[PDB]
Amino acid sequence: ANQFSKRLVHKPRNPFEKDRLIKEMQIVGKFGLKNKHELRLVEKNFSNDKKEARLLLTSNKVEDISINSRNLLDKLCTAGILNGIDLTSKEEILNGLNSILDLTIDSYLERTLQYKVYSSGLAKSVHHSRWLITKGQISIQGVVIKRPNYVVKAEEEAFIELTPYSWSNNT
Amino acid sequence: MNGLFAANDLIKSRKVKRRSDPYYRKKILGTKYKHSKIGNGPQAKGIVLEKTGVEAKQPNSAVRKIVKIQLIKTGKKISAFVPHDGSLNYIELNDEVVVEGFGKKGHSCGDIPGISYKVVKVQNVSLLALFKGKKEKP
Amino acid sequence: GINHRGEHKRKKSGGKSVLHRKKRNNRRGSQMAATKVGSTKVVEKRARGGNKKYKALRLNEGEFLYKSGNIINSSKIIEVMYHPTNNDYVRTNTITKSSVVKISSEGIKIQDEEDLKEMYEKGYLYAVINSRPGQVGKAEGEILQGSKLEFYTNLFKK
Amino acid sequence: TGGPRKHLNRKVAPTSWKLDKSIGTYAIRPHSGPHKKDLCIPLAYVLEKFLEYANNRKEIQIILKSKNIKINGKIIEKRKYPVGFGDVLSIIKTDEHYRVFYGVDKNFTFIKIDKEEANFKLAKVTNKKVMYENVPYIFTNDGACFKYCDPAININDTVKIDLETRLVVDYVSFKEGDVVFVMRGEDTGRVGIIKKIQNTTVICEDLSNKEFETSIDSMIVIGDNEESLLISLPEEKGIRLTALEESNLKFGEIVE
RNA sequence: ACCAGGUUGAUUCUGCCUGACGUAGACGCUAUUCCCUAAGAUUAACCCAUGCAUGUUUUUGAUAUGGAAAAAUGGACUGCUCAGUAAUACUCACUUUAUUUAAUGUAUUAAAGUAUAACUGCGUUAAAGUGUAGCAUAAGACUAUACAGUAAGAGUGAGACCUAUCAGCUAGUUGUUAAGGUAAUGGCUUAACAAGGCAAUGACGGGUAACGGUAUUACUUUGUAAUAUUCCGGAGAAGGAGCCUGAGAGACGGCUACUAAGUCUAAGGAUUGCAGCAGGGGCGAAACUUGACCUAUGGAUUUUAUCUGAGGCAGUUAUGGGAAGUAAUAUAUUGUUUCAUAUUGUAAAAGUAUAUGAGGUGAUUAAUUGGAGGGCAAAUCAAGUGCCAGCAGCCGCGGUAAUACUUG
Ligand SMILES: [Mg+2]
Ligand SMILES: [Mg+2]
């Protein structure tokens, strides 16, 4: 269809496997997701950089080790899935793409604002966070967010608080 | 015909061998415009004329209930199969029906012989819902 | 009315051709205007984007140039002697480009040459037109002298 | 289509006009003028987008009918007037003057200049022949004619127009080792030193000591020497660093 | 970067059918929000009731303080559709010393007499339109070229679907000389002469349910397939032909004739083209309001107040893609939607956002669709019927104990 109306993700290849539904149901109940569909969105972009990580190891260009690969390592580091590395040194750039292949789906699924509340002391359960966010009681440093699947970047991690003027506080 | 400068002899030879594909042969002759039974569409309309039954093939034994209609778009006569139990009691003569196909690429499936169409609507009432009992027939 | 398109002709191989659009106004033609001899008459034309053209229906007293003495003088036009492409124009007296004529030698002051002397006793001399009459609107030409007179006189009626 | 076109579309608009490809559908088709189709911009976009003096269509007519806008020393009140390359526009009020040439990233810029530079103008000769009654003539790029000039000015040399008396005042000849300015091609806005002049291209040297080749029609020499510098240069001076050094300044250089 | 079931008393192969998965249209059942995005292309390039989409401007000033006419300027752009065309149309690379250009920019040159309107006044016909007077009476009309700049015409070469039950084809056809005509090259047209031109590297024929590229989607190990849909280009206004004005029309919300369909009449005559926006009829399996407006982007020769069904803003529809709901902590506590109200906002009205009000419920205002022998996740659970009624894409169940039909 048109660009505004194409679809992003399809059905899996084998609809009924007992060896696939058991593995995935351990992820839904642990992280607290409502649809099987919304799990499929976060794994495809996990596949797409791994499609790009393989090419940069095999590039024979002298500048591709300098530009696009360094433009690969930053984007994960701003969201904070990767921890941090020195971009001036050449040999650690090789280590950065080699560390990329050792990730999982849970490295992406853990930096979500629903789970990141419960891992802090604000929420008791993960289901306590989904019921709390939608009423509008939780705020980042200036903004009041109502989307539990909002990705939390690296620098904005420590500044999660309650809303100061909500009924969840005293006022 | 394996050579570096033999592209003119390779394309001319491989077009001849491609004509023995049984799916590709019907695309060249255009048989779906020439010898189509219903036209080119998902459904059709018709007028009922008879209510008759047929007998299925061996080794099974039953009586399959069908209906002989006449289409509007082309004007031909054709037979369709009533697809559910106790559904023929709704049907009266001099009425309109809607016809849907079986889904086996123009062939007959099951043990019903020579018939490739089934009824879906009677008087703009869904026969799948009317068997469930949600609606009533006027 | 009269087109100058090229879409109607056959191919290089000889196969037929097919059209796909109607007649355009860009390639537009006209009919032939045959300039006769008589009393003078000039009509005007309108061409594409102004640019007026003049056509002459009946022409008289054309201008000619003497090559040896290098002067220009007017003379009358009497008869036509030769026309290259079609030999029927000599009986209908039509003047076109490069068709030799017969002019009066009254106002002309000629030098003393051997060839022109015998015709100069009578009234007539020879000239050849060099301008497009139907589009410029007036005739100009040269007087025959020397071996150029030797070439045309083999083609005369005799 | 039996005649000319009068409507232009925003998607086929030039990207150097810095327009948004958002909600609009049509764009202003400017008038015919001295400049080409590439080096011209409409006037109504200048008072709206680049300069910020008006908000809607009504305030455009207020500044234009008040007769303060002065392009090449002339008052103009038409919003469809094309502003070309190199011309100096000014307001009579507030003594504000600008020169118009491209930036570094193939976009139009406006640079505030001084009143000593506000007088003159630069152009480039393209053709020269002698007209009727034995009078010499020199034809520039924009279409102005000039007679009785110095015979040392050749076909490719540049001139200096006084813009008030409309007389040729100074000229700079065309040779090697001259500072140059480019305005077209894949490389626009480069300022360079001439090293080798070929018959159709020129082999040049950037201020960052690089190299590029460019046809002769796309350049204009602004000075014979580095110390001349007849005009004022832009702030970047047209260096246009590569994407490697843009990747070097962000993250530091690669230690080896 | 992945395979499974089916030929035999059992085994190994070739070979096909079927299951699992995409992309465009139609259909059955069920639906609470918000933002974005789409809607008579497929059959009929079939016929249309009604209403509306092209006029501006002191240039002069209607026995008339601001409007009659006449002049000037644009109606050839914009918008709608895909019938025809297999290449002449389109894309790319070149040429035009072989050509034309109103409105634009810079320069060169030159400088008394003569109509018709509006007005006043006599009329005509069913209608549609038109006539005779007042020596009637106004403004107007009787410079030429260069070089840039936009716009267009004309050439050369290369690329592009199926068919041999289509193997020979072409006579203004191929060339020479000359003329006419065009703004211009050219058998573009006409005289005279000559016999040339193309083909298994597919000529000449036949078919298409064939408008060409492109932005953009899929699937991939050197690349295939779709592309009416965004944008550029070409062709047509019931079917054919011809022409006026004009810088630019072989123009159709301009004129003339013939063919197919009509409509008004007082019977002598007069008249119409919705593949423009709404809307109706027919056709079909198949597609929306006979709605408001110049707010923003534009066009009309300076466009700050004129016009603008181009173009915006709202209503109807499971056309699709997003951010979300229908509970949480241990009967109880707290508190999301279905209700209303301020401000912001709108051309004027919605709507979104920020704040504020009440009432008390998750058996509620707040969940459906398909399946349970194998492929293929899930019952030899119960009651009826007995090769009947029926189910099953393929293999296959139904003969009084059916996990394979009907109900729970
Ligand atoms: Mg199927
Ligand atoms: Mg149609």
Ligand SMILES: [Mg+2]
């Ligand atoms: Mg008038």
Ligand SMILES: [Mg+2]
């Ligand atoms: Mg079609």
Ligand SMILES: [Mg+2]
């Ligand atoms: Mg067609």
Ligand SMILES: [Mg+2]
């Ligand atoms: Mg009169």
Ligand SMILES: [Mg+2]
């Ligand atoms: Mg002949």
Ligand SMILES: [Mg+2]
């Ligand atoms: Mg296409």
Ligand SMILES: [Mg+2]
């Ligand atoms: Mg029609």
Ligand SMILES: [Mg+2]
């Ligand atoms: Mg038109």
Ligand SMILES: [Mg+2]
């Ligand atoms: Mg047309």
Ligand SMILES: [Mg+2]
């Ligand atoms: Mg016509």
Ligand SMILES: [Mg+2]
């Ligand atoms: Mg019409």
Ligand SMILES: [Mg+2]
């Ligand atoms: Mg319509």
Ligand SMILES: [Mg+2]
């Ligand atoms: Mg529909």
Ligand SMILES: [Mg+2]
């Ligand atoms: Mg159920």
Ligand SMILES: [Mg+2]
């Ligand atoms: Mg199982």
Ligand SMILES: [Mg+2]
């Ligand atoms: Mg089935």
